Design a binder for this molecule. Structure first.
Ligand SMILES: Nc1ncnc2c1ncn2[C@@H]1O[C@H](COP(=O)(O)OP(=O)(O)OP(O)(O)=S)[C@@H](O)[C@H]1O
Ligand SMILES: Nc1ncnc2c1ncn2[C@@H]1O[C@H](COP(=O)(O)OP(=O)(O)OP(O)(O)=S)[C@@H](O)[C@H]1O
Ligand SMILES: Nc1ncnc2c1ncn2[C@@H]1O[C@H](COP(=O)(O)OP(=O)(O)OP(O)(O)=S)[C@@H](O)[C@H]1O
Ligand SMILES: [Mg+2]
Ligand SMILES: [Mg+2]
Ligand SMILES: [Mg+2]
Lengths: 154, 143, 261, 49, 145, 261, 261
């Protein structure tokens, strides 16, 4: 039949279902509700609740129908280098949805696998298109992300 | 009140102005002087009408370290001996069809304007008598 | 400050189609007398001279002599977007770094103001003395294009003779040699143009046919073309555009090596 | 030493006095790259020494 | 409608608003005042002042001609071999009227992200077009150049 | 059972020769009102809304509502096999995987059949909420196509500004910019043809060029086109074809940063 | 000494462009009857048998049987110089390595003496016997080339099945399936577009498309085409070039691989 994992089943679909981090969750919710969401850099050991936090944030910001067009999720380990920063990420950050006016979201999971030149171009993509889209980088090691890319994010 | 870099402000206009590599400079200058002599003898044969011992190969190759003066020596010798340099850099699209069909006739045909300001040496891109002379610059750079 | 109003855009379209693949960049030397363009090949073995008179323009005005160097890919891709029968203003300031083309009513509804960034380059001087030639011949231009294209499949060089018997075109190659004769009593029936000669002495020369096909793209500019030749001076291909001016092509002959007999 | 005296010559044309040892250190630093030493000399002289 | 970060709200606009690296910033200041800057490469750690000093030097050299005499290229742009062959060379051959001693400026930020082939294709472009155009590059690791 | 026979096969050739490169997959909605095509660009920046009425079809039968998702490259390959004055018939079943194109003989003896597979796909179901526009003009379509293909040579993004005077096009590129102004007074061979002005507040925006060229590739569909835009709602061009359909492309404006520097 | 006269260059140019890609070299054998060309392709799957009768030539002179073989790139590059109307001299000696083409231009005196070199091919005469063919079809050439381009865009494999009402064309491939049906339409205004049926038994066969396309390249050779299909024989296409001769294209069919039982 079906025996789904308890990791997926007991997922914090809402930001209030996280258990440990409460100061930064309150800070993130306050960034959400006064319309001042910055570029985020969620980093830490696995299983801590970074992807769940950004998915609950994107569910709070966007809807189900516009989830497939307004927020774009990448894994940098699938294809490293600037063939993906100059490409899907740049075209996503520079275009605009036709009737949906607002801001886009880029969820770059496993950002520490990204190469140095791809980070050197991703920081410029972040700088040039700050108003159109916000970037959330999820990573395990901050030591594998260049300080120029770190400083653009909180 | 100057708009020129010091490399091209103090560029050697004579083969004696270059520093070092005197044997290589003398070899290149002798080769180009022999080519100029062959061109002038060809002109004299044209005027009259209207090669193991010589061993004058049609092409020299120049190699060395970066910034030593290969291009500067080539330009100084061609300026001194009256050649006109047609330059092919890596900074322009030089594929086989374009370089052949747009610069073979410089070698194979006469210069239509042989006197005047033609001593200036142009480049190649596609987006007293002066003898033609091709210069392939940085041949190791292949795309 | 300079304005030049071309009566029809077909003139400039056909000129830029003639210079398209042969010339790398166009320099316009412009004074009160008119518009001059002396541009050499990228290989510097063929030279194109184009003189357009001041009176040939619909309205022409200058204030000082000046030279404008424009890239030819950009000017060609702009002139491919111009009305054939429509009137074209060409315009530039005293010392600005741009050149405007005003197309008034290409489709009888809009005004178009296209701009080109000029290039900077050492404008070489091509003023040559007008020496006499030994072999001039009036022959049609569509026929020149036809026979140059026709013999162009055979090889890559033209062996051309001018004497009293007419113009001789020989093309030898791996395909096989081909010979073309022109006669004085011969006259075409396509346009009814008769071959006439003012010859001095026979001349044998040889050229590259690719640049001759590049030259002959100016066939619609004039009904007839004058070919001038001699032993020393290069081949001259002349089109006289009526009330517009004249377009000449100077093609140097191939160097030939005397064998060691 | 030849390139060092050449650079001393181009500096003396610009009304500057320089010692041979400093130019020798620069030339052995950039491995006798003549153009690189010429351009850095232009930057350093035109900025006041 | 948002609060600008202090890295942009308090970004220096001149060459005397830059702290640290006193000798090199002073040399850039005297070059911006006098003119005729050579092709420069600025190497250092992140957050030092390289892009800021390059932009301030270009602003002080150009002035009102910034929008037409300056060509800036980041790592987000293409900067390939073909871009170097067409766009860089077309801007270098482009005619721009400037006061004497002032040149057109091509800024290549994050020159480490430039491929080796593009740097090989940009070698002669750095040389022949040096009476009208200058090159200012900024980099972190100078060994990647 | 779905069966739609057209008056002419030319209109189906012209309607979708523009969707070959812009539209990745054609989703066709079949109901009693007619044929609908509400398709999305793969970059989510352009939308195509096409409506075919039942009055414009020669025959139209339909029992259920259908959603047909088809590939464009192979279907454009099979509509390259069509004439102009002939008649085509599109037949499909309720639960089949075929697209039957019955092709009436241009030579009165050669009846053709074309079968295409149906690629099932989910539908975004994005319905346009049909806002009102503060800048609406009419413009003859060939001029708009000429202007877009002209500005494609200059740059890659155009600035369209509508005001009380008329539509103004701009394109700044590496070669130098190009500007076009349209005046309300227009004199052509026809008695009545001009740019119209029905606008509230002048709006200037910037748009990508390949999408606009793909929009203008369907200009032989209708004689005139209607351009509507305002400050927040995107650009739209509208081809109201003669008595058989309407077509309607939305293009979103691009994000610029050199305006504020 | 070969002295042949083609009265019109159109037929020679079109028959050259017909087999320009089809066969590698043309091997002509010459008797008192006229000109014959029996040539086999590079893959040895198609045969060309072309016969020009002597009275179609204005002047004909042949002292002895003359067999020669010459490549077709030079042919494609020499009759590109022939006009749409002119008279042509095929000249050859009794034993030489050079064939001459003489064009008498529409000019009063302008000869084109184009002498090409041979390379002495060693070929064999593949005499094909005449036999009974079960299906003969009279068909226009232009719309038959249209069917060739119709089935070209669908699939490389071509299927033709001859039924009692006419012929059926089928193309099955990756994209889908395309079928074209022809009926009995012999009662029309002109006898050219009439498709007469004088067949005996139905036959279905599979052929390729590249050599088929090379066969339909001969469309302006004649208005009408004879299609010949029988059991276990090559496809035969007959062109009846008026007042001068007849041409036959033979294509060995693709053998269908039968699955085991
Ligand atoms: N704060 C939390 N509260 C409750 N459950 C949590 C929390 N953090 C993680 N989980 C559980 O862990 C599962 C997976 O956590 P994730 O957030 O996907 O891991 P992660 O933060 O993405 O770490 P990495 O670096 O991406 S592997 C969720 O489905 C939850 O069941
Ligand atoms: N031996 C030399 N004497 C005088 N000036 C020199 C010498 N070598 C280099 N230069 C200067 O350096 C400039 C550039 O040198 P180049 O000849 O272009 O270097 P190169 O030998 O071509 O090596 P490349 O091309 O960079 S790999 C010249 O224009 C001169 O100003
Ligand atoms: N020397 C400095 N003096 C004053 N502010 C500085 C200095 N260096 C950096 N800053 C500040 O930091 C911001 C970003 O620094 P930038 O100079 O743009 O980065 P950078 O120096 O080019 O280093 P990288 O390699 O590009 S990350 C500037 O906008 C300033 O606000
Ligand atoms: Mg995760
Ligand atoms: Mg060099
Ligand atoms: Mg920076």
């Amino acid at each position: 039949i079906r025996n789904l994992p308890w990791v997926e089943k007991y997922r914090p679909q809402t930001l209030n279902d996280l258990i440990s981090h409460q100061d930064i969750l309150s800070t993130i919710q306050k960034f959400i509700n006064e319309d001042r969401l910055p570029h985020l850099l969620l980093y830490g050991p696995p299983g801590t609740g970074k992807t769940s936090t950004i998915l609950a944030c994107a569910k709070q910001l966007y809807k189900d129908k516009e989830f497939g067009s307004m927020v774009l999720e990448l894994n940098a380990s699938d294809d490293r280098g600037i063939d993906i920063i100059r490409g899907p990420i740049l075209s996503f950050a520079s275009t605009r949805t036709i009737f949906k006016k607002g801001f886009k979201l880029v969820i770059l999971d496993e950002a520490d696998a990204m190469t140095q030149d791809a980070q050197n171009a991703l920081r410029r993509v972040i700088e040039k298109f700050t108003e159109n889209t916000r970037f959330c980088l999820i990573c395990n090691y901050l030591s594998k992300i260049i300080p120029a890319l770190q400083s653009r994010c909180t | 009140t100057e708009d020129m870099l010091w490399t091209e402000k103090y560029q050697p206009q004579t083969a004696s102005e270059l520093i070092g590599n005197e044997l290589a400079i003398k070899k290149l200058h002798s080769w180009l002087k022999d080519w100029k002599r062959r061109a002038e003898l060809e002109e004299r044969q044209n005027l009259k009408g209207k090669e193991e011992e010589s061993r004058l190969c049609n092409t020299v190759l120049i190699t060395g370290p970066t910034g030593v003066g290969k291009t500067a020596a080539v330009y100084a010798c061609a300026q001194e001996l009256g050649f006109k340099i047609f330059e092919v850099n890596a900074s322009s699209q030089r594929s086989g069809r374009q370089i052949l069909s747009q610069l073979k006739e410089a070698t194979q045909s006469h210069q239509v304007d042989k006197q005047g300001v033609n001593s200036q040496k142009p480049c190649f891109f596609n987006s007293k008598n002066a003898t033609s002379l091709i210069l392939f610059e940085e041949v190791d750079v292949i795309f | 400050m300079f304005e030049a109003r071309l009566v029809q855009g077909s003139i400039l379209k056909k000129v830029l189609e003639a210079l398209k693949d042969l010339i790398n960049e166009a320099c316009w030397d412009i004074s009160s007398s008119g518009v001059n363009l002396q541009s050499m090949d990228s290989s510097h073995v063929s030279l194109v001279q184009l003189t357009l008179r001041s009176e040939g323009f619909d309205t022409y005005r200058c204030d000082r002599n000046l030279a404008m160097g424009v890239n030819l890919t950009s000017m060609s891709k702009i002139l491919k977007c111009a009305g054939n029968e429509d009137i074209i203003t060409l315009r530039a300031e005293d010392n600005a770094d741009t050149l405007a083309l005003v197309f008034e009513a290409p489709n009888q509804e809009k005004v178009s103001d296209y701009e080109m960034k000029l290039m900077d380059l050492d404008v070489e001087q091509l003023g040559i003395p007008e020496q006499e030639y030994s072999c001039v011949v009036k022959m049609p231009s569509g026929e020149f294009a036809r026979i140059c294209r026709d013999l162009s499949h055979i090889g890559d060089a033209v062996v051309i003779s001018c004497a009293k018997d007419g113009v001789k075109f020989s093309a030898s190659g791996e395909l096989g040699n081909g010979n073309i004769k022109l006669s004085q009593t011969s006259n075409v029936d396509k346009e009814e143009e008769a071959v006439t000669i003012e010859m001095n002495e026979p001349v044998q020369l040889t050229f590259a046919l690719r640049y001759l096909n590049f030259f002959t793209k100016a066939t619609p500019l004039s009904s007839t073309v004058t070919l001038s030749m001699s032993a020393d001076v290069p081949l001259v291909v002349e089109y006289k555009i009526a009330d517009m001016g004249h377009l000449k092509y100077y093609l140097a002959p191939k160097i030939e090596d005397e064998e060691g007999s | 030493l030849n390139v060092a005296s050449y650079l001393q010559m181009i500096c003396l044309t610009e009304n500057f006095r320089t010692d041979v040892k400093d130019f020798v250190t620069l030339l052995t630093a950039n491995t006798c790259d003549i153009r690189k030493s010429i351009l850095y000399l232009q930057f350093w002289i035109r900025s006041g020494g | 409608h948002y609060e600008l970060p202090w890295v942009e709200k308090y970004r220096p606009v001149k060459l005397n608003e830059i702290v640290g690296n006193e000798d090199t910033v002073s040399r850039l200041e005297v070059f911006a005042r006098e003119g005729n800057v050579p092709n420069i490469i600025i190497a250092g750690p992140p957050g030092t002042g390289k892009t800021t000093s390059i932009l301030c030097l270009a602003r002080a050299l150009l002035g009102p001609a910034l929008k037409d005499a300056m060509l800036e290229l980041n790592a987000s742009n293409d900067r390939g071999i073909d871009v170097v062959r067409n766009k860089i060379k077309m801007f270098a051959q482009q005619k721009v009227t400037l006061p004497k001693g002032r040149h057109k400026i091509i800024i290549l930020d994050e020159a480490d992200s430039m491929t080796d082939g593009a740097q090989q294709a940009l070698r002669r472009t750095m040389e022949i077009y040096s009476k009208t155009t200058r090159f200012a590059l900024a980099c972190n690791a100078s060994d990647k150049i």
